[PDB]
């Protein structure tokens, strides 16, 4: 008898509901057909998974006193089907942090296809030993008739391994990234402060060196950021041909096409910051609510017999439905910091599904 199960029941209808409409938005709405948003689709596949055949299951021992209700060898099933889901969500939001820093440093659906498959297929090779060595052993898979991974091995090496390592990974890449668009917002503030320099510079100028000494170093500022390179060229040999008056009035042609170019390098530098933001707060949320399970997992090893291990493992019991919570959230952040996914949320609720 346990009013626990209500609570928990609440947990699975906002996963899978929840995850429903993000898996929907990025298949439906053209506005989300980046990389990024295929990797979330992917994650959310891997929390509606987790909220059909993990949480449910984990709702049923509730209900029998932690007792394993099901058949012996559905055990360790249940536990790496939890396993493989935890490590895929982990590894793909590393593959996120990963994939988005190169992106900044570099210049396909199926180059996206191929990052996701890759990510499953490796979540699926490290939580390999659980049935393997477990189906074999009921001793690293029951402990007083309780489904739990006993084995302190596979809890170790499975703890870092799935959850620490990655999220290592995860927490420097975003620093870089961070890092790497405040260069770029940096380095686009000063070639305007170039740019705008040497435009007041051309519009002062008596004489030819000086429109020429000025067009030659914004055509150097314009390389960082080919119309606008062009466009100063073609007012160089203006300035070398001597023609200063005719060289004044083409550099104030050029101011036009300087804003156009600025504010389009300098939106689009806005809006990954954003995106990075909202990123952020996914990858915060996991490490959070899943740290009080993994640490007191570890503690659990740690302090084997020094510690109440019948408490402990009662923490472990609220500590993996706070992580199973995770679950229920990456959907409500996409409502509150996109407009895209509010929008295509609030069009399928009202059952529109046409864009
Ligand atoms: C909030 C995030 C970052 C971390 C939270 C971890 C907390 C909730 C966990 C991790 C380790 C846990 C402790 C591990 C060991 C023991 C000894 C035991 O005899 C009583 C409980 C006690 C004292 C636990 C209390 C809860 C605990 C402190
Ligand atoms: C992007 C869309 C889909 C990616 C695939 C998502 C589907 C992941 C399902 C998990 C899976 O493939 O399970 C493997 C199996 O359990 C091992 O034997
Ligand atoms: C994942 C690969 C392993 C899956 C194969 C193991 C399934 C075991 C199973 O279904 O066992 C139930 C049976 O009723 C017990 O007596
Ligand atoms: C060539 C060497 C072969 C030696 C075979 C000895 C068999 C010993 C028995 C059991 C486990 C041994 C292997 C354990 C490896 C664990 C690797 C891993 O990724 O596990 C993750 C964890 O299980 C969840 O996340
Ligand atoms: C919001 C819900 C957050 C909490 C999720 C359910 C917690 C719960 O009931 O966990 C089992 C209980 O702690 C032991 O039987
Ligand atoms: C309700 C009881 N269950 C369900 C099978 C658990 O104890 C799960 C055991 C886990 C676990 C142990 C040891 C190492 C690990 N790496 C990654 C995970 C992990 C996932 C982690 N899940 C979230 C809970
Ligand atoms: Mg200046």
Same mark, same amino acid.
């Given at each position: 008898k346990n009013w626990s199960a209500l609570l928990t029941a609440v947990v699975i209808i906002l996963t899978i509901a929840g995850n429903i409409l993000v898996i929907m938005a990025v298949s439906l709405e053209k506005k989300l057909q980046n990389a990024t948003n295929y990797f979330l689709m992917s994650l959310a596949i891997a929390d509606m998974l987790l909220g059909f055949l993990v949480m449910p299951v984990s709702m049923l021992t509730? @209900?029998?006193?932690?007792?394993?209700?099901?058949?012996?060898?559905?055990?360790?099933?249940?536990?790496? @089907?939890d396993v493989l889901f935890s490590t895929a969500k982990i590894w793909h939001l590393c593959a996120i942090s990963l994939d988005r820093y190169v992106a900044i440093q570099n210049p396909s659906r199926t180059k996206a296809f191929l990052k996701i498959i890759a990510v499953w297929t490796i979540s699926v090779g490290i939580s390999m030993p659980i049935p393997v060595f477990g189906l074999q052993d009921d001793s690293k898979v029951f402990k007083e008739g309780s489904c739990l991974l006993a084995d302190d091995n596979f809890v170790l090496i499975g703890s870092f391994v799935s959850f620490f390592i990655p999220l290592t990974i995860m927490v420097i890449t975003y620093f870089l990234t961070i890092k790497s668009l405040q260069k770029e917002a940096a380095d686009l503030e000063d070639n305007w402060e170039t740019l705008n320099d040497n435009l007041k510079v051309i519009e002062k100028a008596d004489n030819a060196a000086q429109v020429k000494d000025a067009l030659t170093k914004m055509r150097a500022a314009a390389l960082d950021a080919d119309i606008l390179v062009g466009q100063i060229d073609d007012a160089l040999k203006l300035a070398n041909e001597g023609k200063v008056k005719e060289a004044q009035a083409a550099a104030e042609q050029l101011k036009t096409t300087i804003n156009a170019y600025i504010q389009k390098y300098g939106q689009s530098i806005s809006n990954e910051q954003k995106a990075c933001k909202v990123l952020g707060i996914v990858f915060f949320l996991f490490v959070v609510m899943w740290c009080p399970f993994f640490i007191t997992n570890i503690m659990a090893v740690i302090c084997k017999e020094s510690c109440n291990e019948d408490v402990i493992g009662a923490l472990l019991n609220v500590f993996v439905w706070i992580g199973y919570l995770n679950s229920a959230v990456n959907p409500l952040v996409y409502?509150?910091?996109?407009?895209?996914?509010?929008?295509?949320?609030?069009?399928?609720?009202?059952?529109?599904?046409?864009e």
């Open positions: 509730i @209900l029998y006193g932690y007792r394993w209700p099901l058949p012996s060898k559905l055990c360790a099933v249940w536990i790496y @089907l409502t509150l910091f996109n407009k895209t996914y509010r929008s295509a949320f609030s069009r399928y609720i009202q059952c529109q599904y046409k």
